[PDB]
From a paper:
Among the numerous protein families facilitating PPIs, the family of 14-3-3 proteins stands out due to their ubiquity and high conservation across isoforms. These ‘central hub’ proteins hold a key role in cellular signaling networks, as they are known to interact with over 1200 protein clients, and are involved in pathways related to metabolism, apoptosis, cell signaling and tumor development. Protein interaction with 14-3-3 can yield a multitude of effects,8e.g., the structural stabilization of the client protein, the masking of functional sequences, or bringing two proteins together. In this work, we developed and validated a deep learning approach for predicting putative protein–protein interaction sites between 14-3-3 proteins and phosphorylated client proteins.
The relevance of our results was further confirmed by X-ray crystallography and molecular dynamics simulations. These sequences represent potential new binding sites within the 14-3-3 interactome (e.g., relating to Alzheimer's disease as the binding to tau is not the new part), and provide opportunities to investigate their functional relevance. The identification of such structurally representative 14-3-3 binding motifs, without having provided such structural information to our models, testifies to the strength of our deep learning approach.
Numbering used by the authors:
A (entry chain P), D (entry chain P): 193 to 200
B (entry chain A), C (entry chain A): -4 to 231
Write the structure that this text describes.
């Protein structure tokens, strides 16, 4: 669930 | 402010040095000092601000997650009572994280957003506002939580509305905004379908515009598109 | 002390949590608080103290090296003048590093070393004294430098004398002391031949004693022996 | 010169 990638 | 006596240009120079040295707390303090000079930030300077605080809060978030997991396990049946220390130390880290988020939000409110008229700057800052409310939401418990979640949502939505009107679908700021708002939907707002729809639509509209781009712009846009794809693969 | 109101056992518990969270500045502050309770430290607690400060000073040393290299390049012929900022920021990092070293040395002097009677504890602390004077030496300029170098040397030599009399040649503390004193010789004291001799003699005497060890002790000793070998390969 | 390994 929390493993989603946000902008680097 | 401890940086009030230092020249703006010297603060920016030292922020860059701090980045090279992986001294991100220093980098953030230099950039806060630069913002507090009162002048608008250039594109490069906005990126320095973002990188600095992202790295500081990222370390705090990672630490919080470690401590929260230990605390949750302590509260299972059959777990031996160990006293207040895990909760206390989780709370310490949490309070420091909230403080960094409040500092960033304060810079945005006084007065970065109100002075930002160009789409690139306004979208950048509104995305940051959404991001730092999102980090507050990750640690919030209650309906306190509800108002924080709504603040994140509102900031992201205003940024999205501007970006769709004013920027091409391949613009990296627009793409990173959509990526982060999709994560908000999935992780915070309990809206996985909205998250998936947004990531898909964003990817597809960017793919259709890549033909307009130079080699270097193509590389910048496709990097972020890959992150959208990675999330879609995790989520579907 | 900010930790004066917290129980000793709670400080130790929180140091362990901070290690798991990779919060090494917090870990160090907890362990400083524990030392200042005035009781001697157990083996485990000595290791927590060491790990905490090693990680803090290690980040500072790495940052200092980055900044020193930029400063040296600025002073080459043909380099454009960029003002005082690189020197100032190197000096800031340097002063913070020196402060951490002075804090550790102060704990050792008040009163860890004087209360340490067993060989394992006394050697441990004297090695730490040598190490933190070595880190001071890395950034020192002058004959100020000479007295710092001599302080490191003296601490290491007292530790070596005890370790040779009281500990087997495979003991991990003894091995790590010899490793670090060899690095002192090579990097600080301009004595590469002494460094190589020490590393060789230490490796060979440990190899001859491995037959006495359990499987788990063998693993602990051979790990450090490999570092001696790695240095010998770099240096020869 | 400075690449020598110290105790971990
Ligand atoms: Ca995530
Ligand atoms: Ca000025
Ligand atoms: Ca203005
Ligand atoms: Ca039990
Ligand atoms: Ca307890
Ligand atoms: Ca709280
Ligand atoms: Ca403006
Ligand atoms: Ca007590
Ligand atoms: Ca006593
Ligand atoms: Ca020139
Ligand atoms: Ca300058
Ligand atoms: Ca100095
Ligand atoms: Ca004693
Ligand atoms: Ca070295
Ligand atoms: Cl705490
Ligand atoms: Cl500075």
């Amino acid at each position: 669930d929390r493993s989603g990638y946000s902008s680097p | 402010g401890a940086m009030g006596s230092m020249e703006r240009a010297s603060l920016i120079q030292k922020a860059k040095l701090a980045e090279q040295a992986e001294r991100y707390e220093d980098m953030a303090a230099f950039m806060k000092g630069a913002v507090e000079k009162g002048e608008e930030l250039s594109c490069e300077e906005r990126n320095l601000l973002s990188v600095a605080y992202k790295n500081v809060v990222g370390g705090q978030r990672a630490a919080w997650r470690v401590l929260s997991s230990i605390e949750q396990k302590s509260n299972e049946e059959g777990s031996e009572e160990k006293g207040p220390e895990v909760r206390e130390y989780r709370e310490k880290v949490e309070t420091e994280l909230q403080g960094v988020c409040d500092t960033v939000l304060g810079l945005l409110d006084s007065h970065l957003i109100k002075e930002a008229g160009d789409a690139e700057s306004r979208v950048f800052y509104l995305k940051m506002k959404g991001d730092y409310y999102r980090y507050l939401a990750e640690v919030a418990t209650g309906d306190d939580k509800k108002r924080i979640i709504d603040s994140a949502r509102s900031a992201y939505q205003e940024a999205m509305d501007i970006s769709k009107k004013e920027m091409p679908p391949t613009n990296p700021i627009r793409l990173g905004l959509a990526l982060n708002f999709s994560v908000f939907h999935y992780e915070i707002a309990n809206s996985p379908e909205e998250a998936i729809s947004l990531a898909k639509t964003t990817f597809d509209e960017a793919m259709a515009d890549l033909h307009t781009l130079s080699e270097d712009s193509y590389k910048d846009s496709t990097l972020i598109m890959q992150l959208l794809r990675d999330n879609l693969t995790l989520w579907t």
